[PDB]
Amino acid sequence: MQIFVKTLTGKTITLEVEPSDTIENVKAKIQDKEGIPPDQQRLIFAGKQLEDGRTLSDYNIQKESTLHLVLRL
Amino acid sequence: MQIFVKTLTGKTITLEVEPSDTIENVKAKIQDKEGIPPDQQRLIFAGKQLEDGRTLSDYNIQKESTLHLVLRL
């Protein structure tokens, strides 16, 4: 499944994920693709800051949803 | 544990706190560092305004969390 991860510069990254992936798994995939450590990543979806132990499906994130990546450091 | 406090101007304050500390304790620690009277401080975390009599643990504020400090008038 593809989702989009949008940075504050407007750059949109396409990421391959599974619909049952946890948020921590997604942060690991962003690390693998972009080189950003999970501790420096904050992900926001439709108003909410996403918590590491919950799945994408549990937030109603699906194919071609956009998550917003904020770097925190 | 250390927590951080960010103001509108970008100033960062580091405080030494225990999770059992009250919000009124945190405001008094901010006064010691910055000189702002506690009755002029408003603290925000996770979209919520923090109440003087509750504790940091009540709001799930953990090591290295960041709070936002606003001022009243």
Partner: peptide
């Protein structure tokens, strides 16, 4: 005036006492 507000940069739902987003520091009143 007392309502929460969404950041136009990251969508986070912010408290009305903040005039910059708690997550990304984008000003509310751009």
């Amino acid at each position: 005036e007392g309502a929460q507000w969404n950041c136009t940069a990251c969508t986070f739902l912010n408290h009305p006492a903040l005039i910059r987003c708690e997550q990304c520091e984008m000003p509310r009143h751009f």
